[PDB]
Swiss-Prot record, chain C:
The rodlike tail sequence is highly repetitive, showing cycles of a 28-residue repeat pattern composed of 4 heptapeptides, characteristic for alpha-helical coiled coils. Limited proteolysis of myosin heavy chain produces 1 light meromyosin (LMM) and 1 heavy meromyosin (HMM). HMM can be further cleaved into 2 globular subfragments (S1) and 1 rod-shaped subfragment (S2). Muscle myosin is a hexameric protein that consists of 2 heavy chain subunits (MHC), 2 alkali light chain subunits (MLC) and 2 regulatory light chain subunits (MLC-2). This is Myosin-11. Belongs to the TRAFAC class myosin-kinesin ATPase superfamily. Myosin family.
């Protein structure tokens, strides 16, 4: 019931991990800019 | 050990088992950077 | 509420697929680094 909303809180913690994943996306697009510099 | 959402890890000083979730962990950087001047170059940017 | 669980999962697999895409393009970029060396 409402405990699945706490599972949704866990999912939102994993969504913050997802935000770290777009941080890694910034990382890889920065390396793409670096290979453009190359 | 890789199983579920958690990993039993090894303490680099003790060699002892500790279980912790895979989604509540933070990593490091290769030794090619050390004594940085600004934290902008922290390519794996995390608080630790 | 219960309906958004499905969307949350689906975006999770979308992020995972983009994760393997990121991994393979990063390996390709490593190969590009080798050829530029």
């Amino acid at each position: 019931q409402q405990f699945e909303e706490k599972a949704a809180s866990y999912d939102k913690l994993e969504k913050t991990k997802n935000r770290l994943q777009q941080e890694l996306d910034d990382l890889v697009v920065d390396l793409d800019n670096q290979r453009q510099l190359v | 050990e890789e199983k579920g959402d958690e990993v039993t890890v090894e303490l680099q000083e003790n060699g002892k088992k500790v279980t912790l979730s895979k989604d509540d962990i933070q990593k490091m950087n290769p030794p090619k950077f050390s004594k940085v001047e600004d934290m902008a170059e922290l390519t794996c940017l995390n608080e630790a």
